[PDB]
Amino acid sequence: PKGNNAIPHVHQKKHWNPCSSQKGNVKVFLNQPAQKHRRRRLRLLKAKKVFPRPLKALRPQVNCPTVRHNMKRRLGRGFSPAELKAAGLNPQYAATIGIRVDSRRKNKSEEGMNVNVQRLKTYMSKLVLFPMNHKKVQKGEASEEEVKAATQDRSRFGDAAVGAVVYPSAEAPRAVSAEEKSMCVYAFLKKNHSAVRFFGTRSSRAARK
C-alpha cells in the first residue's frame, strides 16, 4: 500500500541528526530573542558612545539591478567621488564627516548623481560640525549654542537628515491622445522585438544580395 502520493525528495541521507555516534549538523534558533535583545542593547550602547554623531553613516540612493528590480530603490554602499565633488566635498574629509564613500560605483546617468548630490547638499545643510578647539572656532564649525543643542539621529538607516529613498511620483489621471487611439502598440513593440530577434539572420540574408 503506497498509493498516489508525491515522490519524496526529502534530502536527509547525511548524518545531520545528533546521535550517540554522530555529532550531527544542525542549527537551532533557540537564541534568537536573546540575540535580538543583545543587538538592540549594543546599538543603544554604541549610540551613547558615539554621541552626538548619528549611529548610521550617510549612504547614497541606488537603483536595484536587473529588469526585475530596476524600478526599486535602496541605499547604496557609499557616495562616489564624482557626487562628492559635485557637492563640494573632498572624499577623504567626507569620510571623517560621517558620509560613506565608495570609489567603485560609477555614475552612468545624470539622474542618480543628481539624487545623491541633493542628499549630500541636504546633509551638509543639516550638519553641525563641532570645533576641534572650542576656544578657537574656525570656518564651518558650530557655535557654543549649536554644540549645546546637539541631539542625535538614531534612525535605522541614518536617513533623518535626507529622508527615505525617493521613488518617482505616480502619473496623474489623464486623457488618451489621438495618437494613442490611432497607434497599434502591439505592432510597434513586436517589430522592435523582431528587429533584434532576427538581426543576425536578417544581416546574413542582407549579404548574398
Binding site: 536527509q12 547525511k14 545531520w16 549538523n25 544542525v26 542549527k27 537551532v28 534558533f29 533557540l30 534568537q32
Partner: protein
C-alpha cells in the same frame, strides 16, 4: 630601474645563458642539504616582491622537495573497499610542492614566522624554493609597521594552516565569484552553510 632588467632576465628562463646558470646552480643545490640558510636571496627582486627586506630579522632559507606524484602509503599496494579507491600510483597530492616546502621549513624552525616563498630552481629529481622567514623577537621586526603584524600570535605556523600564498593557491582562493562559490571562505565553511539543517523557532 634595475628591477625591470632583473625581472625581464628572469622571464627568459629557457635562454641559453639562463639554462647554463640554472645548470650550475642545480648541481650546487643537488650537493647541498635539504634546508640551507642563505645570507642573501638568489633572486633579490622576487624576494622583495614577496616581502623580503634587507633588515635585521629577515631570513632566507632554500628548501628542496622531491618531484613526482604522490604514492599512496598502503602496504604492498593493497587497498580495500570499492575499486573507486584502489589507486596506488596515479593519485596526486592536493597541496602543491611550494606549500610542502614552506611547511617543512616552518616545522623545522618553529621560532620563525614563514612569510612567503618563490621558485628558484628545478631539476629532474628535486625542486627548490627559497622561503622567507621572520624572527618575531627581533626589535627591528617588532618596531616596523610593515612587518609588525607577523609578531601577533594568530600568525604562528600560518604555513601549516594554508594561509601563505601557495596555500591560498591550492585552496582555490585565487578565484572569486562563480569560480569559487563553493570554496569560500573555505570548503568546510561552505559545506556547513549548505548542509546544516536549519530549525527556525516558528516554522
Amino acid at each position: 630601474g634595475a628591477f625591470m632588467y632583473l625581472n625581464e632576465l628572469w622571464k627568459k628562463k629557457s635562454s641559453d645563458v639562463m639554462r647554463f646558470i640554472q645548470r650550475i646552480r642545480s648541481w650546487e643545490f643537488r650537493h647541498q642539504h635539504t634546508v640551507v640558510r642563505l645570507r642573501r636571496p638568489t633572486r633579490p627582486e622576487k624576494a622583495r616582491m614577496l616581502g623580503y627586506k634587507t633588515k635585521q630579522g629577515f631570513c632566507v632559507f632554500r628548501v628542496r622537495v622531491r618531484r613526482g606524484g604522490r604514492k599512496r602509503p598502503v602496504h604492498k599496494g593493497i587497498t580495500y573497499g570499492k575499486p573507486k579507491t584502489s589507486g596506488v600510483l596515479g593519485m596526486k597530492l592536493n597541496k602543491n610542492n611550494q606549500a610542502v616546502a614552506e611547511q617543512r621549513l616552518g616545522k623545522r624552525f618553529g621560532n620563525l614566522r614563514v612569510l612567503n616563498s618563490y621558485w628558484v630552481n628545478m631539476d629532474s629529481t628535486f625542486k627548490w624554493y627559497e622561503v622567507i622567514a621572520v624572527d618575531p623577537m627581533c626589535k627591528t621586526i617588532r618596531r616596523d609597521p610593515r612587518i609588525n603584524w607577523i609578531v601577533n600570535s594568530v600568525h604562528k605556523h600560518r604555513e601549516q594552516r594554508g594561509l601563505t600564498s601557495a596555500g591560498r593557491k591550492h585552496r582555490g582562493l585565487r578565484h572569486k565569484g562563480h569560480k569559487a562559490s563553493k570554496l569560500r571562505p573555505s570548503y568546510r565553511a561552505a559545506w556547513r552553510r549548505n548542509n546544516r539543517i536549519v530549525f527556525l523557532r516558528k516554522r
